[PDB]
């Protein structure tokens, strides 16, 4: 019975490809060719955060655009103050192999996880002033790659078992699951409406899911290698993905087709992180060539190059107000660009 | 010159820095190893012998000659080491266990070894090879019902080296078989590396304890190699 299922699936995907191609009347390069370029953009290292013992693997900005969180492979989460360069908090972890971290929008909780298959959530504001483990969500069979907060009692996690999950922090039980991927989910990205989220797997594919339904809303393909990081557009109708083929791909949610591509002959290294600015004109991407590149989202041109790291760039983040950009590499150092 | 909150935050940051400096002394004195190996290799016996001194990763801490060694072994991973293998790029050594008694997996073990030796992020990490279950291989090659040339044609042209120094009272056929199995991994390893890391093959039988010493010595040599790169002596 599989013989007819295969041909049915292939004719369905051919029909989908034809319906997607029928809507492609003009490329984005043909629409924004008359737009003046952004010129040359140069940024300098404003501050350098040191203190980590092992390589830095994760980093996320808060809602106040002042505090920052970083995760090191020695089993340490460090919350820094970006304005005063002082260390606000230091939390030791149970497992040293942490691969992701998250900061709650209210600033009360901090989530982390990794090769221990357990998502540890710590509380920052305690009655005694000391940071303690608030909860340990277990149940996954693979390593955790990314986690993001929806609210004070809901957390979206991505594991290496080709599935994503949404957990209730107040209860501790898995609220819902998202299945369908054929590879390890590598990154997550929440929409501004906190109702849709994209997740890319190690199969050159990504899927947009709805939080309130738990079913696959949309699927996107086009890459040639595994996708490592995905970032949503500020408007909520587009998203950029980066893979190991040294090429970024910006898709839109309404047209369901590859909209923009970013590549160069002198770039043959993998991509580790992607992020947008407030306006959405600049796209920052960290590569394995020890440097980061800021491309023009509307013209696919190299607008700027940020160098200064001695090892592979691991994480890159942009503040909510777009004032500074945090970069973290395997050199155990954090850099602030502006 | 500053408010009370500012100096309080400065004192808190200084205390956090002192705590980090105190933890660094304990962190830098512990050697971290990564244990790798497929099924039916004998990793459980090795770890249960070394412990005499849904979890994700199993951690085994043991002290040898006042030196602390923490070995991390893979747990509930779904047999996909393409992505999470990069997190172990700063380990001291990778102890790779290979079952030399099962021929049908030996070549597969090669496919598991070479990819590790030619990894882009594992070019500066030493690999200690443990060929486990030597008695099973010995009894199999003495039984005469399993021919190695059926899976490796070059074994038909392989001979015992002149510098062979086996243990007193060992069969020459089992010695030639063990030396061929070791030379396979040696040729796979020496194909690249450029002297950045060396492979240390060892013959274990999962019923001996001195292996726990061997690794130690090997680790020492690894550190020695690091010293050779610090003083610009090589």
């Amino acid at each position, epitope marked *: 019975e599989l013989d007819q299922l*295969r041909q049915e699936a292939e004719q369905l*995907k051919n029909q989908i490809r034809d319906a997607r191609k029928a809507c492609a009347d003009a490329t984005l390069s043909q629409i924004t060719n008359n737009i003046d370029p952004v010129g040359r953009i140069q940024m300098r290292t404003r501050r350098t955060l040191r203190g980590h013992l092992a390589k830095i693997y994760a980093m996320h900005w808060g809602t106040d655009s002042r505090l920052l969180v970083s995760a090191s492979q020695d089993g340490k989460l460090i919350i820094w103050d970006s304005y005063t360069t002082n260390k606000v908090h230091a939390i030791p972890l149970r497992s040293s192999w942490v691969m992701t971290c998250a900061y709650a929008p209210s600033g009360n909780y901090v989530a982390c996880g990794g090769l221990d298959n357990i998502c540890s959530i710590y509380n920052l504001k305690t009655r005694e002033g000391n940071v303690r483990v608030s909860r340990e969500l277990a149940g996954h069979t693979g390593y955790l790659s990314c986690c993001r907060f929806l609210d004070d009692n809901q957390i979206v996690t991505s594991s290496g078992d080709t599935t994503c999950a949404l957990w209730d922090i107040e209860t501790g039980q898995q609220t819902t699951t998202f299945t369908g991927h*054929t*590879g390890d989910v590598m990154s997550l990205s929440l929409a501004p409406d906190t109702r849709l989220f994209v997740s890319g797997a*190690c*199969d*050159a594919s990504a899927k947009l899911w709805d939080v309130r339904e738990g079913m696959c809303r949309q699927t996107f*393909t*086009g890459h*040639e*290698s*595994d996708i490592n990081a995905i970032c949503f557009f500020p408007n909520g109708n587009a998203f950029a993905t980066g893979s*190991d*083929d040294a090429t970024c791909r910006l898709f839109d949610l309404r047209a369901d087709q590859e909209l923009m591509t970013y590549s160069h002959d002198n770039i*043959i290294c*993998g991509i580790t992180s992607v992020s947008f600015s407030k306006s959405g004109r600049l796209l920052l991407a960290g590569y394995d060539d020890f440097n980061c590149n800021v491309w023009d989202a509307l013209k696919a041109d190299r607008a700027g190059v940020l160098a200064g790291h001695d090892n592979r760039v691991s994480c890159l983040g942009v503040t909510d107000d777009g004032m500074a950009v945090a970069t973290g590499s395997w050199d155990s150092f954090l850099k602030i660009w502006n | 010159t500053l408010s009370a909150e500012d100096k309080a935050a400065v004192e808190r940051s200084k205390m956090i820095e002192k705590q980090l400096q105190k933890d660094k002394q304990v962190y830098r004195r512990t050697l971290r190893l990564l244990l790798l190996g497929a099924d039916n290799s004998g990793k459980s016996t090795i770890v249960k012998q070394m412990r005499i001194y849904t979890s994700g990763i199993f951690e085994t801490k043991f002290q040898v000659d006042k030196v602390n060694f923490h070995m991390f072994d893979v747990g509930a991973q779904r*047999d*996909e*080491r*393409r992505k999470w*293998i990069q997190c172990f790029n700063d380990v001291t050594a990778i102890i790779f266990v290979v079952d030399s008694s099962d021929y049908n997996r030996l*070549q*597969e073990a090669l*496919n598991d070894f*070479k*990819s*590790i030796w*030619n*990894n*882009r992020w594992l070019r500066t990490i030493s690999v200690i090879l443990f060929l486990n279950k030597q008695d099973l291989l010995a009894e199999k090659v003495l039984a005469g019902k399993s021919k190695i040339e059926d*899976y*490796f*044609p*070059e074994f038909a042209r392989y001979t015992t080296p002149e510098d062979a120094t086996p243990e007193p009272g060992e069969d020459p056929r089992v010695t030639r078989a063990k030396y061929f199995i070791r030379k396979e991994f040696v040729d796979i390893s020496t194909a*690249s590396g450029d002297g950045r890391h060396i492979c240390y093959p060892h013959f274990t039988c999962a019923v001996d304890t001195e292996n726990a010493r061997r690794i130690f010595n090997d680790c020492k040599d690894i550190i020695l190699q690091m010293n050779l790169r610090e003083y610009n002596l090589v």
Partner: nanobody
Amino acid sequence: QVQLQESGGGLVQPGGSLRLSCAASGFTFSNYKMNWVRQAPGKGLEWVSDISQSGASISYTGSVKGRFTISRDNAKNTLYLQMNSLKPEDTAVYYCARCPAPFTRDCFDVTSTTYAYRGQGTQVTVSS
């Protein structure tokens, strides 16, 4: 999408020859290392051969040395595998696998049970 279509299988007599063809689509074929893997009925996945991007550094497993030969044509993006002197123990499903990362010398998880960058495979039966 990464598509790898295999063809050229079927049932043949022992001692014959076959020519398996692997057609790639959706990526640059001249930049990824290719391999041919085998899965026996009732057994696990066993790697057979592999070839790099340019066409050199070809390697085979010990059980197929001297009998199978793999080549690649980048002008048409095709992977050919000529199989001579077939034995009755070679009846199995052949898969055309691709290297996960380009411009590399190491390809991990090419023999995984649920690897994504592989085709459906072709059946090769060797009997009367």
